[PDB]
Amino acid sequence: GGFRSVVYFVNWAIYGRGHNPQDLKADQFTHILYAFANIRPSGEVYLSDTWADTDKHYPGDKWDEPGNNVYGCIKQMYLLKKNNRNLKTLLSIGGWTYSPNFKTPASTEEGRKKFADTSLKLMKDLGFDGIDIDWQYPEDEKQANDFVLLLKACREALDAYSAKHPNGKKFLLTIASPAGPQNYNKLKLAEMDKYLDFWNLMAYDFSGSWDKVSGHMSNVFPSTTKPESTPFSSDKAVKDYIKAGVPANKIVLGMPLYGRAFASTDGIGTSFNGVGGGSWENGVWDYKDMPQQGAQVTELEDIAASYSYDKNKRYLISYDTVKIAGKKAEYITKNGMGGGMWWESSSDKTGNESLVGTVVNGLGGTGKLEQRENELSYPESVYDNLKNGMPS
């Protein structure tokens, strides 16, 4: 089908980062994942920040509107949908901080239905085209099995809702998936695939502060000359997924819009101590703050990896440049993969230095993106302004 362009919009971005949904170049994406909803012990899914999500008024949002109305970033996401009919939005549930919360609701049938019903409720009230589940990660086979059951329960609730509105759209079920063999090898990949529209493979965080040696954090291919610099590779993951029965065109390659740093290092693949500063938190740098003054950039086109290194501070930052992004685009194209996904929208550069723009153009452009109309009708929404299509 065409290629997908998937981005994570993080709801805490509206604070210190100053990134609002209005700043998204909507025409370069097919799918926005709104992160992150949290999970109650009952299985009930709920919004993590009602201020950012529903309450904050933006310019254009009236104070005096009749009826029960939604504002926040949810309204802004619907506005984007109205204006770009090829743009779909999904409610992303879980993520790193919240993943502890999956195990208990997921272990029972009651828990699983509460999850499914409450997530569907959120979807149809807030105007989303589907839900994305990011359990990072199922610790073992039991959990992996429960996760398959969780997916089934959600897929049934979705379909049941579509059945209630035969002429309306179908809805999406998506997940973020592991690139590390020790995590994906315990999942029942072929089983899960039956329920999903597509797989956003988290092909990044291959290295970080948790290691003892500086490594490439999102490279495609392993290094034969320096194996220590590539603990992982996305190619290993993609190939294993396909062997397990997952179709290449349903796998979306996750790409970092940030870099991880290593301090007091002689270079890639050597020991390091500490991670230095960061754009917002230590050890992590936004792509848009790169390159750092005094750092030299090295591009390993063959393994598709890049990093900066400042000889004087002995500081290493593993992150992708435009060159390397075009190389990952190459890879998506060559292997007929489902598209590109990025974490996350606040940190890309604009214009010709944008990693997202580089990949979309390397995919043949916006015309080669999957064309699938989003859903604007939400007749069962509790929110007046949304079910009326945000007339205002």
Q: What span, in angstroms and rounded, lies between the C-alpha atoms of 291 and 185?
A: 36
Neighbours of 173 (CB within 10 A): 21
Distances (CA, A) of 83 to 27, 42, 77, 390: 9, 37, 10, 12
Residue 21: CB partners within 8 Å, gap ≥ 6?
A: 9, 73, 76, 77, 79, 80
User: Which 3 state secondary structure label does DSSP give 41?
Assistant: coil
Q: What span, in angstroms and rounded, lies between the C-alpha atoms of 192 and 40?
A: 23
User: Which 3 state secondary structure label does DSSP give 180?
Assistant: coil
Tell me the residue length of the chain.
Answer: 392
User: Could you tell me which of 340, 304, 381, 254 has the C-alpha nearest to residue 5?
Assistant: 340
Domain boundaries for CATH 3.20.20.80 within the chain? 1-256+320-392
Task: Please check whether residue 241 is in contact with residue 189, taking contact to mean a CB–CB distance below 8 angstroms.
Answer: yes
Experimental technique: X-ray
Neighbours of 1 (CB within 10 A): 12
Do you find a cis peptide bond into 307, omega within 30 degrees of 0?
no
H helix or E strand, kind and range, residue 341: strand 339-343
Domain boundaries for CATH 3.10.50.10 within the chain? 257-319
User: Which 3 state secondary structure label does DSSP give 8?
Assistant: strand
Neighbours of 258 (CB within 10 A): 28
CA 348, distance to chain mean position in Å, is 14
The DSSP bridge pattern shows strands 45-47 and 130-134 to be unpaired
Residue ranges of alpha helices (H) inside the chain are 50, 72-83, 103-106, 109-126, 141-163, 181-184, 189-193, 234-243, 322-334, 355-362, 384-387
CATH architecture of the domain 1-256+320-392 equals Alpha-Beta Barrel (3.20)
Instruction: State the CATH class of domain 257-319.
Output: alpha beta
Q: Give me Rg for the CA atoms of the chain.
A: 21
Neighbours of 210 (CB within 10 A): 7
**Sign of the dihedral defined by the CA atoms of residues 153, 154, 155, 161, in that order:** positive
Resolution value (Å, 1 decimal)? 2.0
**Sign of the dihedral defined by the CA atoms of residues 261, 264, 270, 274, in that order:** negative
Neighbours of 376 (CB within 10 A): 16
The DSSP bridge pattern shows strands 284-286 and 172-178 to be unpaired
